[PDB]
Paper text:
Like other paramyxoviruses, RV3 mediates fusion through a coordinated mechanism requiring two membrane-anchored glycoproteins on the viral surface: the hemagglutinin-neuraminidase protein (HN) and the trimeric fusion glycoprotein (F). HN is responsible for receptor engagement, which triggers F to undergo structural rearrangements that result in membrane fusion. The prefusion conformation of F (preF) is a metastable structure composed of a globular head region connected to a helical stalk formed by heptad repeat B (HRB) and a transmembrane domain that extends into the viral membrane. We then determined high-resolution cryo-EM structures of potently neutralizing VHHs with non-overlapping epitopes complexed with RV3 preF to investigate the molecular basis for epitope recognition and neutralization.
Here, the CDR1 loop tucks between the FP and the α3 HRA helix. Within the adjacent FR3 loop, Asn85 forms two hydrogen bonds with the backbone atoms of Arg109 and Phe111, spanning the cleavage site. CDR2 joins the other two loops to form a deep cavity that buries the sidechain of Phe111. Refolding of F is also likely blocked by binding of CDR3 between the HRA helix and DIII of the adjacent protomer, which must separate by ~100 Å in the transition to postfusion. The interface is centered on the β10-β11 hairpin, which is contacted by residues within CDR1 and CDR3.
Residue numbers in the entry:
A (entry chain D), B (entry chain E), C (entry chain F): 1 to 9, 11 to 30, 35 to 59, 63 to 72, 74 to 109, 114 to 128
D (entry chain H), E (entry chain G), F (entry chain I): 1 to 9, 11 to 30, 35 to 59, 63 to 72, 74 to 109, 113 to 129
G (entry chain B), H (entry chain A), I (entry chain C): 19 to 95, 109 to 161, 168 to 215, 225 to 246, 250 to 435, 440 to 481
Write the structure that this text describes.
Amino acid sequence: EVQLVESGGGLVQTGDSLRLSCAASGSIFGENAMAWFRQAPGKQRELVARVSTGGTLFYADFAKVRFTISRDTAKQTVYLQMSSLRPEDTAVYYCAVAVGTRNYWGQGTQVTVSS
Amino acid sequence: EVQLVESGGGLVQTGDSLRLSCAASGSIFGENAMAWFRQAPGKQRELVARVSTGGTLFYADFAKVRFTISRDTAKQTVYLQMSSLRPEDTAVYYCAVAVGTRNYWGQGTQVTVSS
Amino acid sequence: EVQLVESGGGLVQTGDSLRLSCAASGSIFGENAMAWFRQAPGKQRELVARVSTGGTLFYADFAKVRFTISRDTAKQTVYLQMSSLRPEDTAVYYCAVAVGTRNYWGQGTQVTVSS
Amino acid sequence: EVQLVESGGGLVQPGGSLRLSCSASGSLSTIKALGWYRRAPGRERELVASITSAGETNYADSAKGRFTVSTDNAKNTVDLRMNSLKPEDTAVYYCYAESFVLNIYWGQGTQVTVSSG
Amino acid sequence: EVQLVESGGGLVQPGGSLRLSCSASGSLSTIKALGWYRRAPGRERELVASITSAGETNYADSAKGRFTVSTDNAKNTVDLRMNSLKPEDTAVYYCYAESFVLNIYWGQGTQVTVSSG
Amino acid sequence: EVQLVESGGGLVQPGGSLRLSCSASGSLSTIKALGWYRRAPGRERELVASITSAGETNYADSAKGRFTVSTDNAKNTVDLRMNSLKPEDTAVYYCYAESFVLNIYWGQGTQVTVSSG
Amino acid sequence: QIDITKLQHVGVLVNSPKGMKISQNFETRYLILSLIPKIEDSNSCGDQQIKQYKRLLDRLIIPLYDGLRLQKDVIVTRFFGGVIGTIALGVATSAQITAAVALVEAKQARSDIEKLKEAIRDTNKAVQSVLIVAIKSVQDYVNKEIVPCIARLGCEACGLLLGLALDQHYSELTNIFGGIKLQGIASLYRTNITEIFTTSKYDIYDLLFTESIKVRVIDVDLNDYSITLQVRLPLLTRLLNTQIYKVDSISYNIQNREWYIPLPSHIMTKGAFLGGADVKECIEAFSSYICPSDPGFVLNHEMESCLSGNISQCPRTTVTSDIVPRYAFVNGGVVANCITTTCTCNGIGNRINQPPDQGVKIITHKECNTIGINGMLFNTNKEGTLPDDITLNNSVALNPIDISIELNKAKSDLEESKEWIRRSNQKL
Amino acid sequence: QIDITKLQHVGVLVNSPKGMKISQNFETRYLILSLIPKIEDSNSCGDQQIKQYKRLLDRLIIPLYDGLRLQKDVIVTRFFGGVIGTIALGVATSAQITAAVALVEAKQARSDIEKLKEAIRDTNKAVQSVLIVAIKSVQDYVNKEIVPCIARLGCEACGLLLGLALDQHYSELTNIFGGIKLQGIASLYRTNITEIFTTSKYDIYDLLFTESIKVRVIDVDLNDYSITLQVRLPLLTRLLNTQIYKVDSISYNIQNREWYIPLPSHIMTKGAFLGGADVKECIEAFSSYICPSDPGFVLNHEMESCLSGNISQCPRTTVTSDIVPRYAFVNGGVVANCITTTCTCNGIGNRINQPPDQGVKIITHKECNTIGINGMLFNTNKEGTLPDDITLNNSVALNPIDISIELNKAKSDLEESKEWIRRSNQKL
Amino acid sequence: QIDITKLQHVGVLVNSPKGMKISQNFETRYLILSLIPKIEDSNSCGDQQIKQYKRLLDRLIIPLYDGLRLQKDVIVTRFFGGVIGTIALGVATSAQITAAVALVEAKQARSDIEKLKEAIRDTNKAVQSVLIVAIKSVQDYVNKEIVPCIARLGCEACGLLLGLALDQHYSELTNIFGGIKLQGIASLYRTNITEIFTTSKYDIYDLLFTESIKVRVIDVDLNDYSITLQVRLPLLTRLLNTQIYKVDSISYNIQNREWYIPLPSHIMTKGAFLGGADVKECIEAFSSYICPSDPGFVLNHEMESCLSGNISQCPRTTVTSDIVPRYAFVNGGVVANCITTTCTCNGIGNRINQPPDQGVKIITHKECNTIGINGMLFNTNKEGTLPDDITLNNSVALNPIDISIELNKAKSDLEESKEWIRRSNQKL
């Protein structure tokens, strides 16, 4: 029922920066938990960062300082600004939103850190 | 233990008005739930109106606008003013008071809507 | 772990007064329940007085007016001032302190009401 | 256990009077109330009268201000005085004992009939 | 109980097209969705396509934008149109019916093979 | 299981000294404390002394400042030194092992008697 | 008394009413169980198995006898109103005083039982009465099978069979005696209550309730190996003007959140009284509930006013699980939260939209001929009898942690208020 | 999603994760139980015991049949999307609507069962199938023992044996039928699920879960003395990106007091979702939990933020019992409240001191080679992978009385604030 | 420590005290159960039933063996203080560390058991010891009945009897093994603890407690079909200066309303400690409670002060059910709420009036010779030992909804206070 759209991926040079975005529309209202996952080709899916219901930020070991996550409740949009990219970051990034106990996944954008 | 007395019934002409009253004395104290029931001869007993503990009024389909109920906590008295009577209202009216889980019934007054 | 020390006992003449004291040191902190027990030679141990957690005082039948108990939270010290002694009060007095569900007993001082 | 023995039933002319007696025996100190019940042909038993150890007395709707009941603690008897009988009063009357723990005991039952007149 | 009969399997040249049909019979008013599943030698069954009573249709990752499914309520048939087949598409296809209470029913299964070319 | 073997009991003159030994064998790494208990004719067993793995030692009311206990971890022995004995000290002494899970093990017991003098 | 119509708008559904039958009085009858059967065989066969069986019964009879003998006594020992007895020292609650008075009432019965048991010792009937009823554990099986076996097979052959039969009975006795309900004893002896007691066509619900009443052991005999119990048979009476209603709460929508009105499973109306009912201990029949005592209890004034039609007072809590229903049929129509549940009218081809300000959608046969819940198309019932901006402000939490967290916030605001007061007093 | 490292400092320990297997769909198979065995003996032996056995079965078959016949009906009576039926009058929750739809789906099956039973009446096989499977109560015991006994012993000799065998079966039937879980029926007939149904090496955990799913009685036949049940066999599927974690809270020290963080026994992470899990109804395997539906539920925002690494928001409560642990091994090291628990490093000869401002001491193999808890010396694990002034202000109480006492204090402070406001308005 | 006299005025009744016996230490003894009996018959009779019986035992022995083998291990492998072992990776709470240490202590015992079992394989004794005790499932029944039957009846005749006997034992085994308490095993083998272990006249309460302690399975042998358990026998010691009191709360009258003081069922006093006791897990004897560990727990300061005689601090709640008593006998007199309960002095002819400001009426033998409660006349006890305007302000609610509704009112008053502050700051 809830439609998730994400944009901002694509080819990027090594050492550059990107700002992924993901918006939600439909019956979603109020503060909700949003997260960004990653899955390299031929590798299991892993979490990049998450914003809990109350705004408490969480970051993975690879995203402790290189990446930053933010939430815009009025627009139900989650942003992930990748300040410093490395060649191993090349993977598919998936947006996730949780409304109560229901978890909705979006069509993951692909990011290639070319060199 | 609680004595219930009711007065104000009797013969009444069609289209007139009456004000039934019922008072409680004894160990009854504070706000209590009071109700007025009715039972036509050869018919099952039905509820006319009720006053809950918190003062929320309730009325039956036949009492939605024709009848009004009020409570006087200082006097532990419940009033039922029948503004517009009809010949089918001829029946026995019974006062009911609830103190906790105990329900006390009074000696029902008789009302005859003559014509 | 908690060390209990008590002092102020010894020989005393009939009709005189004494002030027993008991201090606690270690991991004990904050308001705690303190009590004073007594055990005559060849007799079962009995309670003299107690100070509950909230400061509510308690006294036994023999200590209703003759004895007084007080607590000093800043020093974790319990005092028992025996204002009027009688020859039958000759016994061993034991200090007791309760920290949660744990009860600690001290080395009881001996009081002899000589005559 | 409380044993109840009834007496005083039979035939009576309409408008007459009758006296029904019920004798009790047992641990009566535990019985809360003593009274009489009635069954009519084609319906279940219904209460007629009851009297408590304090003398508090209640009657049925049809027995209010029409019948009376009494007890004698010394001779351990229960008496029912029937007055102003009607043709509809013909039935079977039972005496009962009710315990403080809600136990009920019934007698052998006696039939009371009234002439049509 | 819902009985499913499959048809349309066999051998096909690579790059060709095939039509698989599945006939259902029973309390179909209780079936929530109808679709097709696939098992390949050496792996478990996987979903291929499914269509709900409202016409909402979903496909697998490998079937997205490549296959299609359709239904005919009047003649009570389920049809699967296979186009742009690949040598890796040789497998056994099953038609299934899913109930509102999550009950699943399977057909007899038909084998679909594609020539190496 | 911890097997305990006691030795050193017998008869001694009042005011003399005696040395009681107890050898342990088993999963002693699980035993929390080792000590000695006493039973007298006509009463239950009572604690005499105990020593923990940290060397913390406690005694009974009658044994305080009068007896001593010691251990040797290398040769796995428990020794009890009895000094300033009294005519009331004649009894049966047992050595015990207490586990961290509150399991207790007892030895065969040795009788210690003192002459009246 | 209950405004069933308005409660639907807040998701509170009231089911069909049922009356109440209450046990105003009880008939008391004593049941004697004799555990040792009588083997009529003149060759004394089976005596060895009976001796072994006696040794096994001791594991149950002795614990019961010890428990009864060591039970505390609260009354120690005519006229219609004489003194029952003397108050024993200690503390005795009303339940213990009532139970003790019941045991005093059985004093005369016990004197009778002691004489009847003598005749039960030598009788060979399975069920006998002299009312007081006595049942022998396996006498029926012995007379119909073990007695005729001796005449055909050897004593050894069916002697072992008697052993296994008695062993099975012990396994059943220890299951029930190892409180006690009459259903257990009835099942143990495989006999109906109507077959045990010849006293009075009653509905299956009444017999099921009679089998549910507890039985108490009045005495145990170690010599005759017999146990006697006091059985209470209820006299059910319909409590006029008493109704028990079942309350079902569905999900209620508030700004795309899901809320529900927490209410008791059952609510009762008795004249002027309105409150919950603890039917968990009662039996539910086709038209009434059979209870041992009035199950009613007083509700919070906000819930009592909510059920009286003042739906603005109804307490509401967030839905935190799938247990709470999201749709329910009501009087031939569908009542559902059509935001989280897909509601379709006259076919799946169109979805009915529920405005965010509306919490529950009520669909009636006068509007939609067929209603589809999650694709489940249903035909509306033509005989069914199924625009106000209602706002509910009484938000409540069902767990102590949530209340504590909110209470900490209130305490912090109190401290800020006190500080602002101190500032105002100091500056002004 | 969970900051396992920071939670250790507040005494919250997260155990090894496990995935989740959920029953997305179920296979439906019908099981017919025939309670009357067939004695093939031409001499009609055992007929007397069977007649008595029939009388005993009635005590179970009749109650079940009466309960089914008097059960309320919520749907009253094709195409892929036709109307299921008509809404019956009354109130029916989603659970009842779902259960009723399941019974409607069995309408066609019931018509088939009525024809199969005719062949089951005269067959003598213990387990037979035509899938629909039928099992005879004691046919296996009869064929292997009671049938050959007639040829060697007399009819009387082993006739009594058949009686005791049937009596044992009744005691087992009444144990399970007196909801119903497939494990009960499997144990009653002493037969494995793989032997009953020939449908598909699966792990013991999967079979244990299949035996845990409930079975419903679809019909009872009083003439053939047979009961039929609908058995649901689950199709387990691994729910990707789903993890269930076990949470263990140890004692936490605050100014010589003992506190602990109250958290659910199990917590779940599913993509962006974080919350508790009700695994009490699930089966725990070596690497996953098998559940009938998503056990997740929404947690309080303070607990969700606490588990997300913001340990300053964690709720804390006073330790009032010895149930709460005071030490626990974590990833090869020891995590304990070394104030109330004696912690020793490299031997009992020295105790590590914990400052009053530190709540939990974390001891790792990089510091102490051996760690002693209350004298229990343990060797640290070399392969294990185990200075911030954290303050927790969200004090919470787990009992309603404590909250009420604190709420009364807040109300008293509110009255004082209102009085001070009245004084300020009057004086100013 | 408790002011029993003052608590009566608030309706709090303290019953007769009892001491406490605590299990400071446990004796450990191992019990080996051999499920396969030995049939001494040289004709190999009964072998067919034993083969079938073995197949049935597998349904229990295999699940137990699998559960033990797959159990997680928290410690992996001398001197009086050597290292027990190495910490295994994972998370292990104090309970698991303690349980694991117990299994390590049994390592030496297991090596002994493996040698004893060889002698148990060929022995034919029902109970044998070498302490370690071994019991054969039905060896006693076999030797006393099945062994002599072969010499008199045919092998076939009593062969079937052995089958039914073994079948009964399986039904009992699956009942207890299908935690485990020693009472279950004692009942299964119909043998007393004193007959099993010859170790030490003790009261029935001590044996009942010993039968209540749990037993743990240390190993299972699939070849010999034997199960061995570790039995812990407690050494009870009387905890001096420890008292457990039972607290009974009666209805208390406040302005014609009924209130009661909510208190724990049992309260304990231990020196300076005063608090509740969780006796639900303990055994109650004639003069003491037998507990596995100190059942005490810390109470709220208001309840601790209430029990210390400061009755003005006692929490009070409205009576919402008939469960709460309204009258109770205390020390030979009657303590009751004589407003809702009819109290009569020296006969029913006069009712004692209780002023509305008095909550509980205390009637003593010095005033009324006979006291009548609802007409129940009772004689006062001459040996019994049974004017202050007390006000209780600590009103508390036992349900979360009531607290939430009151908390919402407090929050609304806080908002009004903040608004009045804003108005004052803006105007002034």
